[PDB]
């Protein structure tokens, strides 16, 4: 059932400390697996998912080395972008990168990710088909025709079918007991000091495993939902979430109004 690859990496130019902050976060589901930060006293990758401890420390070095070493490119690419985009060096800048192997239900992959963004908007990105690129503008477009010749797609293609998934499958199996969980919404409603006479009443989730839930109100007959509050599913921050969605009601006009909570992690 169809299943997470990503490395969300960023190096962000410090102006007055001086050297740029780099973080490298691995996501197996929705889930962490590892993070690393140049800033932490001693920079290494640390296991995020506890099952990750059941990983040899050859994996640690073998990998933190790829970080010490990766760190080292971001810097050089930050300055190289400074030129095209004509910026100073006394200012802040952010190169972000995203990649992964688009999992699959049974074992095979379906999608290749390889996108870069410089200073908030997309810079350079690898297409679906893994061979071809898409640049945003002329300077970003210079990275394009060069990379092009040399063979960057090939080198990534290699890796997106390869090392990638082998590994995904690893964490996937050395994962699973922990990736399955889940948390039932612990719900309710609240009447409030509101309106005119128009009580505001709210359906609070408040903290459920894993992010996905939607909750609706019933007149008695209909799902209002053509009508307004809810809230962005927020963390907690123990590792659960909370959502609240609501309506207006006459004063004492209780008459009818219901709500349905949907969280499969839950048979409502």
């Amino acid at each position: 059932g169809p299943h997470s690859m990503r490395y969300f990496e960023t190096a962000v130019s410090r102006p007055g400390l001086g050297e740029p902050r780099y973080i490298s976060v691995g996501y197996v589901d929705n889930k962490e697996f590892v993070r690393f930060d140049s800033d932490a006293e001693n920079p290494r990758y640390e296991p995020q998912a506890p099952w990750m401890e059941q990983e040899g420390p050859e994996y640690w070095e073998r990998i933190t080395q790829i970080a010490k070493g990766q760190e080292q490119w971001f810097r050089v690419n930050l300055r190289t972008l400074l030129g095209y985009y004509n910026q100073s060096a006394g200012g802040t800048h952010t190169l972000q990168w995203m990649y992964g192997c688009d999992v699959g239900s049974d074992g095979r992959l379906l999608r290749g990710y390889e996108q870069f963004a410089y200073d908030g908007c997309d810079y350079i990105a690898l297409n679906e088909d893994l061979k071809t690129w898409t640049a945003a503008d002329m300077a970003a477009q210079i990275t394009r025709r060069k990379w092009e010749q040399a063979g960057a797609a090939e080198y990534y293609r290699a890796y997106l079918e390869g090392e990638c998934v082998e590994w995904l499958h690893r964490y996937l199996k050395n994962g699973n007991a922990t990736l399955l969980r889940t948390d039932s919404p612990k719900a309710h409603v609240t009447h409030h000091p509101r309106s005119k006479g128009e009580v505001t009443l709210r359906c609070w989730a408040l903290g459920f495993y894993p992010a996905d839930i939607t909750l609706t109100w019933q007149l008695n007959g209909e799902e209002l939902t053509q009508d307004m509050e809810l809230v962005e599913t927020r963390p907690a921050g123990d590792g659960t979430f909370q959502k609240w969605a609501s309506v207006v009601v006459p004063l004492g006009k209780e008459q009818n109004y219901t709500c349905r909570v949907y969280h499969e992690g839950l048979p409502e």
């Binding site: 963004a117 997309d122 505001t200 962005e232 921050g237």
Partner: protein, 99 residues
């Protein structure tokens, strides 16, 4: 392009004023990843400020979970304040018992 964040202040467990609870400053969808978050009791700084780490999402936007400790009250107002280079002057947002 640079983003102006969206804040939310909130009871980590429902407030029952006067037993504990956690307060979260949830700051979302901004750029650049330089953010200041001052939580305030009444009117002042708080010390104790746990800032849970930076992840950024698919539109490259950043976000972090800021947060402290409080005995909710009849009395005290607590708030969050986010200095960020996208905003001209700051954002101070209040914890409201209903939201």
């Amino acid at each position: 392009i640079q983003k102006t964040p969206q804040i939310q202040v909130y009871s980590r467990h429902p407030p029952e004023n006067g037993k504990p609870n956690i307060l979260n400053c949830y700051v979302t969808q901004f750029h650049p990843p330089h953010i200041e978050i001052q939580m305030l009791k009444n009117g002042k700084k708080i010390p104790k400020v746990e800032m849970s780490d930076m992840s950024f999402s698919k539109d490259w936007s950043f976000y972090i979970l800021a947060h402290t400790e409080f005995t909710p009250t009849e009395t005290d107002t607590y708030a969050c304040r986010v200095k960020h280079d996208s905003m001209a002057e700051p954002k101070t947002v209040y914890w409201d018992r209903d939201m």
